[model samples]
Target chain A: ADSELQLVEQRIRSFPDFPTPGVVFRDISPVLKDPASFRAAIGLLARHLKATHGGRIDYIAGLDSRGFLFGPSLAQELGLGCVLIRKRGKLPGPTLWASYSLEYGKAELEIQKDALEPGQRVVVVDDLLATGGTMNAACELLGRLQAEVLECVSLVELTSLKGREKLAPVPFFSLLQYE
Target chain B: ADSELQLVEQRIRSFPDFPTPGVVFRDISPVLKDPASFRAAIGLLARHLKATHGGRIDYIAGLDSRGFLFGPSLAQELGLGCVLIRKRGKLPGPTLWASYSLEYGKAELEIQKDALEPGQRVVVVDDLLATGGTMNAACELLGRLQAEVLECVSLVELTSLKGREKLAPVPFFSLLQYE
Candidate 1:
């Protein structure tokens, strides 16, 4: 696992400043563009979920945008349903909304009212865990829908941001960590 | 195939007006949230791609946002790499850009300059084919990279829009059609 993690880490590209100055952005495009690396990443996530949650998870809820990349693939691997927790206005029909603060400003996320039935166990997946605002908002939205959040999983974690602290009681698993 | 398509189609939700007035949106959230249907959807796409292009396709290029949902899963299914064609400024470094006009306005998409190797056979995938603007731009960008676009695949096609006429010669496939 350590060797595979090193290979996956090498493919990630870092930009000095992106979406803003003074912030180094880690890009996972390289990893996604490589078939072997992408498969390995998903395999690791699926294995982790199976090992931890076993068959307890009823669905895999992916955050909008980047999370959409791996959520479905992982869901298919585990033979579980996949749902989207998208940015506000992207989804139609009745929806539950949650707003949270980003490093720069505030943003809102939404999930369809019927996306999940009450008491469904879900595992939240995303590409990065920055300040944990997005994941926290996702959990809140799921809570409103009466769903159980088994855990939150991300491919990369910005440790300096301390996002994990904000998601207390909800275990977070990240494949790679950058301080 | 027809039965599988029917099962997938039944889960789609339609909206009267979305992102603006006078435009109806086809939402696939319901299908994505169901494990059996979601797996069938991906399976159908993979089978279609395999049957049509076989080993000719080297990569799957998914349009920004929604396309990301099924792109990776399809790529993994076919044992191919997945590249992202995102909205401009979302990608880093040198990139190939294409501009297309949407119903409301103009939009631009970008692909990393190195996202694809020259002469790679690629298939573009998206959730819906409305104006075909986005998929056309995606094809144009791939052309710029000297990649051959086998076809464009969508989950649903708004037949009234005649998006297929715009993507001539490249071929297009959709699981379901709506007029």
Candidate 2:
């Protein structure tokens, strides 16, 4: 394991049965609470994106809520614009929407109609990849806008959920993975 | 006006009757879309905080949703931790809650019970200052944890709503103000 990622992995805290029973919620709050680990997380993500995609990424499209946490910072660090992909009813004016299946049921996501110009290459970001439903919906919404998805990036991946397989073809990168 | 702030003001878009009729929405989406403007907004805010508060701020408490946008970046930039102040029920397990009056009715905000240590100074941040209800509640919640608030910061201020007065004694700073 990389030294910085090892530091990040150490900072992540897990709590049993949060928002539901029999579930362990991996909390990034502790990582964010430590400046060194937080900076390393964003720095590692930016470096990874640069190493892989370089100039191909025109924007960083961050998923709503948790994605919003690192999206803007990464975008700034990489010298690219940040676009928001929010939940339904959160964005004003015309929007493009997509629905995806969650562990329990279904949920909808939205993106502003004019958020991206056609043909712009984007890298989607989120804190976690669980089941990959939300990120898939984000990709679909971006697809509707005619934007090219260079890759999807995340801080943590629940490998047992096999979310990466769901985001096929578009490369996915994560700093940490848990079984 | 500062040139960077002027650039930020220019990037902000206004939409008539959004989220309701008779209310004009000041959108910061365009700012995020332009890398230069977006960088300027965050830089200006950081510089302002440094000039005013010096080393007093131990954490940056960003409000839910939009506040999540800049808080972590600012916290990382300043080498401090970014704590989340979220909407009610969003945070998992044992949170300090406070209620405040919004334009329509009352709403509650929460902070994780162990988010802050006593006597830690924090700066509360949000995208906009409307009626100040939400920020007020955030201050109240932080107070319950015995955390001292250094100031409240925002990118835009709706001066007519007089949100600043409500946050008095803590000090309030904003990049732009609208009547």
Candidate 3:
């Protein structure tokens, strides 16, 4: 069952000190370049949601940057809405904001008001789950809007960081887990 | 007709010196966020193609970066194959390449060798048609692969630049044209 997930893990490339020092960036660009692998990753997400969420997801909220890479395709695959939760001042609408603390710094997440309808079930997605700072804040914003954040998922997770701790109370899924 | 296109032009926000200096960037993030506006843009593209190249397009070759945003959705809408042309070394498989000189610099375009079967007609898409350097190189790459470069479409066009001259002999389309 996890073999397919294992295939995804083997395909990701890790770049040391990417964009900053002491950060080992898990690059999914390689995995995404291959049509088979790219489809597989989306399939994994769709399959999991079908089995657990009963394919009831109404929207997929993807964080800015890397999340942009997967969000649209995942939404299209599941026949659901895809929303972008961008950085502060990025979205050009009446937006709701939430800020949270990270291990190295603090960050904020913003979503356009009415980005999702009330009671819509959403799945938050990111490239890598590190300290879960942004996800935590995003979840708070969604809760404030009366939306159900059914799950928080990442393409990759640094288990050593225990990012899941910050995302407690919401179940998490990482397609690829690494130390 | 043109009035509708002009409405799109008026809505675009121009930011000076974004990501670098001496360059004015046209951001489309706002246009995409609005469901009605986004659908309008795609609807315009579909209508234009149907009038000009209906039953002729075999695929839509989307350039990387901004093109990635609209390629899949456009392909699905047209019921045609979606092909990606990326910066050199970005694609994993055997690919064909072409080099072009840009207004500011230069870039190389790449497409998977087998992504498009021979003799197929394709439409190239990107967010903006600036100097048309990148799009030219993309067309050259497709030509070398025996895929007929039928049309070049973009969200916006800097008409004063005369970028169309570079891509002459192949019809070009843009949702919004700026002087």
Candidate 4:
């Protein structure tokens, strides 16, 4: 059960005091660099979705731009489609947006209004689940489109952030947890 | 050969007068929207690589964001790893930089110095081959790190731009060519 997870864990790099003091930034570059690690990481996520959702997930929606790293590959592995959630103004045509708070002000995300049909099922993905604000904001946007958001998942999560509470009523999963 | 290409071509959306007058912007979001189309696109790319390189490609390097959409899936399809080339300062740790000229000033790209091995072979990928500047610059970056760049490829290319010449002797291929 834990073999694939262990393979992914060994490749993850912890950067001490990155971006600010007392913060250790987790980097997945090493995982992406090595073929076996990358395969194991994607397979582990694919394993979760297949065991849980099992052919019901209509789409894999990725949060920009880090989510872009995993969404496409995961969708491909599941033989499903991948949809992008981009920053405001980055997408063309009619789009719906939702804003989320940050340290200073706020940032926004966009999904094309026609990207999905009413009642389409989607599973949102991101590289890391930190404060859970962005994932929640993305879920809200998908909800407005009448998409059935099965869950929000990430490759790594900081259990200390305790942001899992931020997603109550909507299931959240992270393959690897760090305190 | 043509069936998968046709399936992918059907979903491509072209928007005229995007970001400027008399210019048409091709948006791939449509391809990403449909499961069948997305599979075909990635499958088509994998087919080409296998037919040509045939198990020799060590890695698939994607350009920034757009390439991220295809690179991972392509790598997965081929059982290879994927690396990223990003805008300067976007990547952490020690990196190598390459500069490409832009309409106004100049832009730069960086690759983590340790992302690849000295003799590992790579194929660089991007969404669209417009000016060919970025692809060439990426090739240069891989070159500095002593990785052998097999080719530069894209899903779509505007032949009218004629930037293919910019790649010199390095081979370049595009699945769908427009104009």
**Which residue ranges in model 2 land beyond 4 Å of their true spot?**
none
The TM-score of the first chain in every model comes to 0.96, 0.95, 0.92, 0.93
Q: Can you write out model 3's per-residue Cα lDDT over B27-58, one digit (the tens) per residue?
A: 77555444445556666787888789879988
Report RMSD (Å) for each prediction in the order shown. Answer: 1.9, 1.7, 6.7, 2.3
Model 1 DockQ, alpha carbons vs. true complex: 0.78
Over A75-170, each residue of candidate 2 has an lDDT whose tens digit, in order, gives 988999899999877888889989876766575899989999899999999999888888889999999999999999999999998889999988
Better of 3 and 4 by DockQ: 4
Q: Model 1 over residues A43-154: C-alpha lDDT tens digits?
A: 8999999999989999999988999999988888898878999987788789998987676677589998888889999999999998888899999999999999999999
lDDT (C-alpha) at residue B82 in model 4? 87
TM-score for chain B considered on its own, for each of the candidates: 0.95, 0.94, 0.91, 0.93
DockQ of each: 0.78, 0.81, 0.13, 0.62
Worst 10 residues of 4 chain A by lDDT: A99-108
TM-score of 3: 0.63
Candidate 4 at residue B111, lDDT? 92
- What is the TM-score of model 4 when looking only at chain B? 0.93
The docking quality of candidate 2, as DockQ, is: 0.81
- Give the runs in model 3 whose Cα sits over 4 Å from its true position: A1-3, B1-68, B71-125, B128-179
Higher-scoring candidate on TM-score, 3 or 4: 4
